[model samples]
Target: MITHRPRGIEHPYARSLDQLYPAIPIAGQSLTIGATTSGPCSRMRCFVLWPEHEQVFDMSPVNGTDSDAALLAGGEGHLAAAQQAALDADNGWQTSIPHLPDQDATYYFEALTLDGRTETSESFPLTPSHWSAEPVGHIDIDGDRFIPDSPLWLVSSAGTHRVKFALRIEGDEHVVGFGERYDQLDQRGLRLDSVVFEQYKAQGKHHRTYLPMPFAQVVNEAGRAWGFHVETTRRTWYDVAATVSDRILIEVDLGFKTPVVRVNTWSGSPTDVLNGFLDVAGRPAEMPEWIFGLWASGNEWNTQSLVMEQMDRHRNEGIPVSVVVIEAWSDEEGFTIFRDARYVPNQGQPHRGPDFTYPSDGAWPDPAGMIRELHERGIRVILWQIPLQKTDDDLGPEALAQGNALIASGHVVKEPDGTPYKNRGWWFPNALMPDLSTEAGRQWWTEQRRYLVEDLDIDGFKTDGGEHAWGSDLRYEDGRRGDEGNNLYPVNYARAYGDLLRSAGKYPVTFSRSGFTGSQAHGLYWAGDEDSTWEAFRSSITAGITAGACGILYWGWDLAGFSGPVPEAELYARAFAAATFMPIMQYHSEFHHHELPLRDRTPWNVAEQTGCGELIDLARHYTRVREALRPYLVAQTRQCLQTGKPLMRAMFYDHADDPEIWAHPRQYMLGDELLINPVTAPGATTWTTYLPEGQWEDYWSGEVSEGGHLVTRAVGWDIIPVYRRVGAA
Candidate 1:
């Protein structure tokens, strides 16, 4: 069977004649064709029918030494290990064509098996299109508008494969804000894409993201700022002076041809840019006051006893935690049932309540009771949720029934061939995604978990794994293709959960890792899974700053990182110190099956491992500091909701005219009063911070310093350089 068929933009290379490289080619670029045959294939050949030519060219395989390079070129350097294995097995074949003819063509493959069977594949396109941008019109901002020196342009081409535009920028302009960027805050001289991708780890190196927006502020030396927002859910690519300095190029995949594209342009201060963008994109919802408190989680704390024991440890250590997110609390199949809880299958109908019996010997002896205890201690509970109906052969009766019901009710995303679409991502391979684009699906899916809030008093949901929906061939209930709806899926996922929480009269505080343009309206966010390393600590800081600039007001990261080994005590303390000033202070750990040398991110665990009891004291001190700053956070959150200013304000947000602030990418204003310069490096006894032009008082030492200058201060493990604007209430 042919495994990698000729299709555009499908991922995970297989052993068939896959799509051409560059899918849609530009002139003067070489193209590669690849195919893999599973059966005993003696020979493989490709036939190309060039555009406007009535002749077919028989393409030959590349030379032996060039095979690996050709194959990688076809996969765009993202070939999976399995695909490599297919190549190693002598089943994969490739043909390279140099310097495309600048015209559209069709190509197909023919495979001959040893048993004398000949197989022919379907034809795929070699679409070569030229793109050009021209100034079309101007968009009004706040009843007043200023045209760009080089106005925002509309891109067009004879080819229908993609839409693109290029806007000229001054040489000194800084490009910032693309939503949760882990790389650099000022994205100038970088090429980035706006597709929601799960970069697993090392997001800074990958330069990909779980959250991306086609919006950014372009600040110039004259203290003027202008930004552009492309209003589409298509996969977008941004070249911020990477290839052509002084030009910002944006390319959007159209999937199909469209008559018009909308690009909103803004001119004013950075806050004004945000206000205009938020006015169109939507504003963040008002979160509960407790949402700003310390949030704690550990994926390994799956069972009732483990969760309770952790909470008790927090109390015994005198470390305050306002929220605990139970990640592994749910059964693997349905994700609605608590693990090991004794209950009758409800047939995906009326939701279950706290009346279900919880066996004393089970993993979760009493979920409702556990939640009640946490609530009484003034700690909120958030349950982890995935948007898929997991498709495993060993699904329990409850999960089986729900899965069958979802399929029967036509409440799942489907393939273009009308079959249920399995999740194309690696996280939940073969799982069916509920089509939250439909009212029936939303009601059906959320109704299953409604009892978690209405009866058990669950505070919120950690909406995870929203980047699973892949493939352009997938179909949604709203009659949109996956290309049109993939990015919108997370938005709809969080929105559906938020709607569920609101229906239960609870604040819609979903802690999500993946979101798009309008995601700020639903919940808070955390930097997705990261390793416990100093590099990750620095990356997370950049993520928070960029995410906040994109209107993600209530945002934070897994303190000291979430994956791999537990952080060193110094890294943990520094991270905790930084998190204390963040919009949502939280720490989480990856699931390690309760392995030895415990990897929980809790302060006690770090202290125990590093033989540093001071870490506990540090945790207590920060928790108290976080509590003391709660009023300021709440007031600023309200102000953000009203004025569209981010709670975690980027330095450029207020000091756009100060060229020096750009050098301090890690420094950010916590609300309008406090400037936070997190100590990111380990073994740092001193840290340098930039203070804007104003009178500032050291939050720890009360030493006054003039702004618009860089100041170096002595710092210990417990110190995160914070300065409050003098005379601010």
Candidate 2:
């Protein structure tokens, strides 16, 4: 019911350009721009610029997130008259861009929403035959359209809001690079979209994730390509395909900016190379051996004695722990080496606030003694990094005033002249999230590293809460809008944190939660927020398989729960045993610690089963498996860094032609060698297993199951279905 007038935006910078048609509406609220010829940027590629309305109630710019968070713009959804809006004044312009390159089209504007955003999807001028266009963006860029360096034919649509997208490619047209996927290596000659990790059950591509990723240059192997960069919490879709007419069309929202798309042609002689990382050489560094052990930790690890007691518990329970995690409350005396466990601001005050995340002085438990002793005993340690702003924090107002702590956004709690955003620290009367997306802010963040690596001598730290990035307030040096820089910042954070470890010429890996599509460049991923429940276990199964399928080399989870009152002995034993086989293993839990009897990994409540022998056996078994597969894992990880291939795969990755793999989410392939089917249900003994067309050997009992058949395996509370490929090792 809408029509569009051609914007005829020629960029003024193009070498030669012409509008071939007036705007036309193919779908509601969508418009397209037609072009007569090609243009330039890095390749024959073109960029479609979209100016989004900053007036929406974007929560990322604000500091306080829990209900108290405020918006930069008023709640009113106001649409101001933009300079570019005048070109296409008629609102009825629905679907499709007005432009299509006759021979070199590489990109197009996907869709434009009322909130003021654009989707840039890639396409070709000379279309091919084997591929069909499907919805792009969000979770996976799964489209079946094929475009040979020869002409690729395709169709595109800017599908909008909570819609299902489908892609149909011919059996011959090989698909490549819309984003990271798990099916094939280097993404060469394959179709892939796997963004996943962390789970107790699923371990391979079967454990896939579904998160929309929108940040890329989107170049085609052929010279023609499209650039699709979008930002917003709204629903979006894409479809790309080759038609019988020897042309390709990309359909999506915000598509008018550019219709025909093209990018720089790639070269490598069919040699393999990976894409989809914010940084290049996207490989994870080698981690220390100690990093492989079980950790004892909690969010409330505010007291030094508290950590020591847990250590004592491990000693008493004979739990073979390797790493120990200390979080925000861990800081007491503001990171002071002299003050082991007290907050410097209120050293003498009663323990009554939100609890510090770090020690008072950031002074480690016992640097020389601890590291030396742990090294002698073969145990390593780890820590946490909030990367947030707290009013009375180690880098609080005092430090900000002195410029020791950089403020990238508005003012702090007391700076009325500064921009306003709430802060969540205890001094909550007024606070804001200091903008950290700026170059200066990044430099400042980098400085926090020296204290840890040089002064504290702590082993490593995990990055938490990158989802709360601040960029929209118009205060940051980069000028990126709120959450606009969300992905980029976390991806860039590699320089601020991981870069140091990498530079140390030691191990470099960050245990992180949020960020953009290419964050794997920094380090590993831990499955987010699994609680003490049956469902959490199930979710992890899918999560782990998804992560592996997505190309991220490593991922983990808080063994039992992030917050808990001690897990059921059954859950703890089962979860621990399962977690040990992961890329990284650590024991972490919260909330439940208050009732833990000031503890160590005592398992007193479940002492009979979780005893010292349980501890040693679990540790040894996991270590053995991990060590045995080290070389293979390292190779697979490198493959991910180089070719955007997944370290873990689903049966579909290997047997994409098979439909059986698609239905089995409960099971997964671990590096083509091991098949893991954890006991997801609390008391299920007879579990169904799908053997993916191959001879298999059992890991526990060494029994053989002929390939290509469904068989029920009997397991007790202590076992689930796990086996190795006939010759996996």
Candidate 3:
């Protein structure tokens, strides 16, 4: 599938005007604007147009600012720093306008590309607003009443772009849980925001996310965990003691006039805090036991023959895969239609299994037959889905008719002016998104795909790319604006699919990569796209851990990574080992056209790349081990639903009194019984792991060791540090 930016002046030639610092411009103050061009430009400039005064001012590019240097230096590691620098040097451009006009003005950026093509950005407004906040009433959570040390303020202004609030933090408090954070477990001195954005790659360095929630747990010095959640779907920022060492400053966009933002707070253990949150937000539904089995996928496996070949390889190699995710099964334009299937166009009616005829010479000659064969092998099939109505020029007749039908029925999301809202993200840009917020829209969209499960007997869906909706001016059918509902889109997107599965008398099993608050109830999730690198591997672990803290029970990541090149044998083996202990075990690879030496994450591909045939053997052993532990995984998951204890959680959840557990952020408990410390760094022979105060036995060696101490053990390619609590189930 083609990745594209929005058309028109807004993203001319794929050149985008990304951000404007201090979104609410102040009178007589300098303002900095950032833009990314299609490529390195010969000249970058901004034009400010004040219609009231009939005046225009030209602004020049600012070269090499300290902020850029700071951004580069703030990378997670040397490789991350180099990647940041490379990105900045290539497409990053900025322009600063000093001594702004006191009156409202409109502005747009212009770029002179190296190839002599001129591009202009979409117009933006610069309205100066004086910001102020007033003290509101005290918050009462779970019978624990406490006033904000600085007084909870309801911020407002005449021309305010966003609302603001501040709260004091206790000393030595560790802040965690911001919904699938990959940077660090403890966000003590970080500045992050809540918006469902697909940060294509290097999410750790950018501090952006496809699944962000404005909720966090603050564990104080006394080991008491208290939490706070910003109750608004609008874009919200969190300064976790970053600006002021003892304060958390929150800023929210002005989605509503005089927005009555409710900030809910609770106090208890981490589990209790999460339980309280889930009680209101929503708890995850019990997934099928088969979901705990190994899942295999590859975007390059588009044809039926390729999928069958891979499944045969897994079976022949003794790799026990229970589910296969077919990402490229659908037609490029009409996602509901199977690829290469010959069928008569049925514009208004939803297609059933008998509506189409599969050609033997086509890519998918027999989808139903393929699914049936996989089912006989005890393997379930999950087809991929994207919430978009393609508007590309090459749209097929059926897809075009469906798009027209959706538009005519007013089932698509709309802009403020009532035009169909197009996806603004780089992936599948200009595509219309179905308004899943409304019941009619949900039924309309899902009905088209109901046949996939009801007639074809498909097991589940891989709900991808729910982060395409952008702009605060967009409108939803639920009478909510985008600022109040964009983040909710993914939640609804997953829910619609889950509901469809349930309607078909099947369990809801949506493997999604994007989500927001209340997403746990809808489906399972995986860490979004990343390259094959050690940094990505380490980040994925933190992502899973933090996601679990937010009550995301079923979570996993693409083993090693899914983008760029395939991982080396060592990284692949280590990541696979770690995933065996996660709630879901999956390995997926991205599409690389028909690239040579195929970049699929299959065991055979990795083994061939590194000339390590033993890697295949190691995969077989781990798959068997994962299968053997499926019962334990299922039991623990069921227990979590009742107790609010995450299947994969931080050590502090079990041993809150032990202060030492806070130091080992990377280490986590797979269940109540086992401790998992994945080997993150490369080429390490020996690894040091800290065990909480308890009796533990090495999972592999069966040697018993006393806890409350650090143990260093020789590590090898096949070893992932695991210790089980003695006498525990």
Candidate 4:
């Protein structure tokens, strides 16, 4: 054995802050500061400052300048800095000044690298702050932690699973837009986990979402706003004032070897924070013009005959439908892709296979003929798809065996031992999930889709199920593993599919569930897997606006939900109205799990059941209403694409000065001028509504409601409350 030799004594690890943390002035109202350690120590990353200037405010529940629900306290402030301490280098200190409360003002801090060299950060102005820099519940960091807000950084190298971060929520402040949440719009009592999950499969304390956007804006009672952004790709958990009273303690998990978490914060009105958010994540691409029309889709419209029949009905009733989804009909090798169609080794019989195409020998006889007919009628088709491969039939087993699945060694994600990780067999034993991140996998999946578009004539796809497959122990070809990579799988899945279609010279607009921050680039996103309940319907209204707030510009939800109990006639009409002022109004429900055999979500059937044939007429009228707003929708879509603003916005997004808007999550702006508050309460012919600061004309009654007042009105069973800005029409 070679003898252990100690040559030149090595430099010891820096343990504490040593030098004077100097504040240097820079361009604008910003300044930077620096400090050296005795050996080397922890440096400040970012700073939080409460404005020293006072302002006129009102956030008192009993009264404020705005509305009763609106609160506005102007003095207190809050901020949290994500860990950005860089170690093991230069023994110098350096940090950058980034987004803050004042545009002209900025601040800076420094981290010492292990290697010996001096690193000086560029300087900016540091604004005055109100909260003490010492935050409570501070965990000890390895090096002497610089107090930005307060206390030390939670050392991830130690038993600390996550870096603890806190923001003070003092007086009359409510939080909103952490992600596509369905629960309460005001996220005060919420301890939300930003991990996308199938809501129906695993509904949580609040409304569920397949996309996790870790950003929230806290609107104080004074209508002034400040926001927090966790600028890390790692899976983060947010406890909005949950743990320590009056604080949003955000814990960034470092167990997955995530680098320093950096947070960008700013203070202003809600609009200011929104602009900052857009600057960070970038805007979604502009949607195509054709997509602005009304679309129709549902569960189990499997056969060509069924699809044609439904389309014909819509046409006969003079309902204008733009797109029709051929839901999960891809595995129809003979019209059999679900249940008894595909077989498995563990499950039992089958020479074990069939061709993987749209129509089999029986179900849909002429796939091309059907699509051509639809095109002739000015309608497009969207095919449903999931990442899971059809193993028993067609090329599935062969692909899985050849390591083309998530479980297979060379596939997307696999077991630690390099074997396929097959857990829940939705259709077959962990049906192989093609790794879209890989060239081989993407090309393989793309070729399959290309065949449909080129040979068979399919339009876009209803990209589904990017969640549920990735597990903690699974491995990927690119080496991204565990929850860190799994949460982002859906985004990549949609991305790969979108890229494939675009490459084949097609306008790629898709109906998709499950997303991450950048997933907006994929296409149209929707509220996923909700049950048919007044709760789900009302919650969905919150979901749409929340998603748009998070940069998902184009979004909608199932008009009458997909599963659970079938909806009543009034419920169906109410659901239809909900989508009226939203983007991409579509109708859908679960035919496979419905209570009655012949029970369908078709407007025709619901109209007949309610003994209210006029309901069908109402639906047709709404479809026409949607078409009439095409120009406005197109303009808003462009605005979202260019500026990263959402088309469907929370009331507060526009009327930030109106504090009451924060409480009304159900009421939302369709674009810039119209307000839509769909009736979500069951069996209620009348509803209560709060109109923001604007002269509003009721779309139906043509009655004008003055701004800053609450109105209660009786509506017919089929009438949805839609308001247009007085001058808009």
* Candidate 2 lDDT by residue in tens digits, 249-344: 323322212222222122221122223232332444445545555656666555555566666666665556667766743332222222333333
lDDT per residue for candidate 4 within 151-245, as digits (tens), equals: 23332112233456566787678888777887777878777767765544223243456787878888876677888777755667777776666
Q: Worst 10-residue stretch by lDDT in candidate 3? A: 1-10
What is the per-residue lDDT of model 1 for residues 256-308, given as tens digits with 9 covering 90 to 100? 43335578888888888888889888899988899988898999898989999
For candidate 1, the 10 contiguous residues with the lowest summed lDDT are 138-147
Looking at candidate 3, what is the lDDT of residue 99?
A: 71
**TM-score winner:** 1
What lDDT score is found at residue 310 in candidate 2? 65
TM-scores of the candidates are: 0.91, 0.60, 0.87, 0.73
What C-alpha lDDT do the candidate models reach, one value each?
A: 0.80, 0.43, 0.80, 0.62
Query: Local error of candidate 1 at 696, Å?
Result: 1.0
Off by over 4 Å in 3: 1-23, 31-127, 134-161
Stretches > 4 Å off in candidate 4: 1-160, 201-207, 257-259, 332-361, 390-409, 423-429, 438-440, 591-596
Candidate 1: residue 444 Cα off by (Å): 1.7
Q: Is candidate 3 or candidate 4 better by lDDT?
A: 3
Q: Per-residue lDDT for 621 in model 4?
A: 78
